[PDB]
Amino acid sequence: AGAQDFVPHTADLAELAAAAGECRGCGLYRDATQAVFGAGGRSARIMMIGEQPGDKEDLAGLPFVGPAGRLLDRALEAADIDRDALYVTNAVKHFKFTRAAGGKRRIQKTPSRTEVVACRPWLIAEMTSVEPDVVVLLGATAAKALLGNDFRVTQHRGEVLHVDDVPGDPALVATVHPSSLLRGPKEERESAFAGLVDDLRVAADV
Ligand SMILES: O=c1cc[nH]c(=O)[nH]1
Ligand code: SF4
Fold first, then answer.
1. Which numbered atom of ligand 1 lies nearest the CA of 142?
2. Angle between helices 113-130 and 13-20 (to 10 degrees)
3. Hey, which of 6, 94, 127, 198 has its CA 20 to 30 A from 37?
């Protein structure tokens, strides 16, 4: 099912990342430039999972390099977390997108639950490889990937979760996606930013 047969029997992240470049576990590899695997090392204590690569990531080959990534860097720095000590990845490894006439960017399209479940074997391989103490789930798609399709990020802010079907039983912390913090009225964005820093500090204190 899905990406399972494309995942090699190794925990080496370089070899996992190369294998993901050849994945056909769902249809998203066709239109994307390349797979965008996670970034960071296997000594990382904190793993962070977003939704999917965006336009910039699809061409950089690295996660969280665009506007959402700059906000996240801001939040990490405010939380006194070294981004270089984390392992950062996404629930889905190929950019799902469309373009609109007049657009200044390729527009992300939400992965279906089918695509998320298809790609999840890579996430399981990354978690097995890294053995994080805590997993930060950034946004609804990532959080649902590990916590169930009905899970609501908005109802469990600040909470340390543990689920039995997750390898290694890491602590799980689900928080707002940094893209959500990019727009809205200033006071709303500032309150939301503080809440993201709070959730990152809860994860870091596990
Ligand atoms: O890597 C990235 C970039 C933007 N949004 C995500 O969910 N992940
Ligand atoms: S999104 Fe995931 S499952 Fe689908 S082709 Fe890409 S790596 Fe494979």
1. 7
2. 160
3. 198
Block residue for tokens 């609501």: 152
**In which element (H, E) is residue 49 found?**
strand 46-50
Contacts for 5 with CB less than 8 Å, ≥ 6 apart: none
One-letter amino acid of 1: A
Ligand positioned closest to the Cα atom of 25: 2
- DSSP one-letter code for 136: E
Cα–Cα distance measured from residue 86 to residue 75, given in angstroms and rounded to the nearest whole number: 14
What resolution in angstrom units was achieved for this structure?
A: 1.6
Which residues have CB under 8 Å from 65's CB, separation 6+?
Answer: 56, 57
Domain range spanning residue 91? 1-206
Q: Is the minimum distance from the CB of 63 to ligand 1 under 6 angstroms?
A: yes
Say if residues 158 and 44 touch (Cβ distance below 8 Å).
Answer: no
Domain count for the chain, please give it: 1
Contact indicator for 174, 161 with CB cutoff of 8 Å: yes
Q: Which ligand 1 atom is nearest residue 91's CA?
A: 7
Q: Is the CB of 55 under 6 A from ligand 1?
A: no
**Does residue 52 contact residue 141 with C-beta atoms inside 8 Å?**
yes
